[PDB]
Structure 1
Amino acid sequence: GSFVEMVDNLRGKSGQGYYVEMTVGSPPQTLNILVDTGSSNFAVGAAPHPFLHRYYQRQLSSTYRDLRKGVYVPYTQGKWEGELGTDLVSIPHGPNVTVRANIAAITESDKFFINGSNWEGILGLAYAEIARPDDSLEPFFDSLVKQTHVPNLFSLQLCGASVGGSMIIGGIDHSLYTGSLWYTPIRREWYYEVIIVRVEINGQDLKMDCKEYNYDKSIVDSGTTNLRLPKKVFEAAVKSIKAASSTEKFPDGFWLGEQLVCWQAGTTPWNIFPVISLYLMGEVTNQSFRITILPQQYLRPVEDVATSQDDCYKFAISQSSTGTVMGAVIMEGFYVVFDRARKRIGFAVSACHVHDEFRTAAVEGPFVTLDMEDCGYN
């Protein structure tokens, strides 16, 4: 076992991603690996770095094999190259197994590792199709399901505020969410690609073309902090959120994520910021459901030192050229099930949820929505 053992096995720093503990090689070297659903490559720093307090020493693993190949992985921000090998891997606070998994040893990286982040590697939980340099490179989870009896499914429970959560590998832990799970189809098994059929702000429809929401694509990426929207959608929402908050004033560099906002501690005017409702395509015909986001999610907190401590937040909705990204701020407060087996993603209200005083982040269905297929971009 056991699910209770995997609960609370993620840790993080705010806006710095969630990591889990893994071991690589024999004898086992323990490293903190960022859980990333927007990528398909298992990689760790194998070289010294100013931002790393640990790294993978293949020289110290009787089990390391070399694929005599090199790889380069770009991300929306940050990139790295290294040497492909295969070693033995285990998750201390996950299923009780060890598997031979492809591993990229990171030899050189730009804008990838984070100063003070406690993670020295990344675990791409998406599919092979987006693996580098090709789908030949079985991704970790594929290896794990192919070499064990771990079911082909995992759920992520990302709790905010430093920060922690749970990664239940191979099942659903029912003590971690309330209500019922709602499922949206994985449109295609490359990214975790979902179809957003409608968007509402404070109960008002943005009334854009369904396609605009998934222009390029929409994905669930635990590895991206913000909620990232296509240009057109993004602009619409900012306009909407601005109007909802015109009572106060902020630099338009705030809405760009550049500047910061602070209020006298415990004085945050949550009420003037709206809720955002994302309607995801459902499991039956003409059926969808919605998840509702509180400003406590897209207003991310960031500590600043001041003669008065205050409460400071960064605007956590960013413009995108790669499609919509349902990042960690969206995933926080929900229990998200990556049902790779039944080709779907389920959402429920997390046990560790947002808890506004007069508003609740919710998962609600059923909703009827016609021509939902017309929302996928082609």
Structure 2
Amino acid sequence: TTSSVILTNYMDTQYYGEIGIGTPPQTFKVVFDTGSSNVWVPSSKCSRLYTACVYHKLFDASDSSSYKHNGTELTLRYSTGTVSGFLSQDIITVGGITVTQMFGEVTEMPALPFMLAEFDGVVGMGFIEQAIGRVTPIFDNIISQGVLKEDVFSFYYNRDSELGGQIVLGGSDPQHYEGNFHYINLIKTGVWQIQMKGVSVGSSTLLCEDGCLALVDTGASYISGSTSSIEKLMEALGAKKRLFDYVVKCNEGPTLPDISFHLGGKEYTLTSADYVFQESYSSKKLCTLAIHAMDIPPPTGPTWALGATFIRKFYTEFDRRNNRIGFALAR
């Protein structure tokens, strides 16, 4: 079988789909995260002093009859934000499929960044090893059920409007991709990470000398790398730094050089159109790039993170039988 979940695009930095928890099902907007492995949604026991819990949909286990207790405390530590709560059990519905899943009822949600989020929670599509509290990941359960047509899933991210995107469990959709897929094996298992044999700034392969790591994060809005790495990189496009953003005069945006990522022998290039946010062409105004500098500590980092910016150009397939990642041109 094959099931797909349709996503929503909110300004190219947030892609969320919808899952249902409970009986009757309680609908929640979520982000499908290849960087984590736990599944969470806010909970009723979340104190209204956390403004985030007042702005998002909360899970009531008292209004769900399939709900089973579990106390287990949880602290998920993302690189941009943190949340805390306890384990819970109920039946989740993900685009057709129904799986009994253990999730976390968050009770602590910091307004930064949670207050910026159009979605309510997150669903980790990572391995059970980054799985906080060894709780079996939702993909692993759907697998166990024996219903999919393939032990894989793919992502499609679109470039706004003014359909968002789409996740397909069990395969790929040839309508959103063209040519042939090209696989890259995971270096280690338990992490959607692959090796990168340098990043090329225009005509100087000025980044990646000796080889680095690349985390394909569908739960990252930008492409990101080490402060240092990114630092040389900006130097080259010639960008000026803001709070925790980078920029260029809209005028010259469309003039920046191509950025190329060497994966598996092939090289995945990004045009200045793919990574620069062209909301104008003035000289008075500054445009934000979709590449951030973020130092990701081991054991996982240091790593580059191919997120939003990258998945928009290359449809991504997460092979779980063969443990590799395959990229192909998006449509």
Match of 2:300 in 1: none
| Contact kept in structure 2, 1:78 and 1:111, CA below 8 Å | no
Match of 1:289 in 2: 266
| Contact kept in structure 1, 2:201 and 2:207, CA below 8 Å | no
Match of 1:298 in 2: 275
Q: 1:301 to 1:321 in 2, by over 3 A?
A: same
| Contact kept in structure 2, 1:257 and 1:314, CA below 8 Å | no
Could you report, residue by residue, the CA deviation over 1:282-309 in whole angstroms, capped at 9, with x for unpaired residues?
xxxxxx1111112223223569xxxx9x
How far apart are the structure 2 equivalents of 1:345 and 1:85? 31
Q: Secondary structure at the match of 1:174?
A: coil
How far apart are the structure 1 equivalents of 2:199 and 2:2? 38
Could you report, residue by residue, the CA deviation over 1:106-143 in whole angstroms, capped at 9, with x for unpaired residues?
1112256533533111011111111113xx21011111
| Contact kept in structure 1, 2:13 and 2:222, CA below 8 Å | no
* One-letter amino acid of the counterpart of residue 280, structure 1: L
> Percent identity at matched positions?
25
How far apart are the structure 2 equivalents of 1:207 and 1:15? 26
How far apart are the structure 1 equivalents of 2:253 and 2:64? 52
| Contact kept in structure 1, 2:12 and 2:159, CA below 8 Å | no
Give structure 1 regions of 4+ aligned residues with deviation exceeding 6 angstroms. Answer: none
* One-letter amino acid of the counterpart of residue 255, structure 2: I
* One-letter amino acid of the counterpart of residue 140, structure 1: I
> Greater CA deviation, 230-239 or 47-56?
47-56
How many matched pairs? 315
Report whether the alignment pairs 1:160 with 2:159: yes
How far apart are the structure 2 equivalents of 1:221 and 1:86? 26
Q: 1:302 to 1:101 in 2, by over 3 A?
A: farther
TM-score relative to the length of structure 2: 0.87
Report whether the alignment pairs 1:219 with 2:215: yes
Q: 1:123 to 1:193 in 2, by over 3 A?
A: same
Structure 2: give runs of 5+ residues left out of the alignment.
297-302
How far apart are the structure 2 equivalents of 1:24 and 1:302? 38
How far apart are the structure 2 equivalents of 1:331 and 1:241? 21
1:271 Cα shift? 4.0
How far apart are the structure 1 equivalents of 2:275 and 2:190? 26
Report whether the alignment pairs 1:347 with 2:330: no
Report whether the alignment pairs 1:279 with 2:262: yes
> Greater CA deviation, 15-24 or 331-340?
15-24
| Contact kept in structure 1, 2:20 and 2:92, CA below 8 Å | yes
How far apart are the structure 1 equivalents of 2:116 and 2:205? 41
How far apart are the structure 2 equivalents of 1:145 and 1:177? 24
Q: 1:293 to 1:56 in 2, by over 3 A?
A: same
Q: 1:200 to 1:80 in 2, by over 3 A?
A: same
TM-score relative to the length of structure 1: 0.76
| Contact kept in structure 1, 2:197 and 2:208, CA below 8 Å | no
Equivalence map 1:182-221=2 (5 Å)? 182-206=182-206, 208-211=208-211, 213-214=212-213, 218-221=214-217
How far apart are the structure 1 equivalents of 2:197 and 2:247? 32
How far apart are the structure 1 equivalents of 2:319 and 2:244? 33
1:39 Cα shift? 0.8
1:269 Cα shift? 3.6
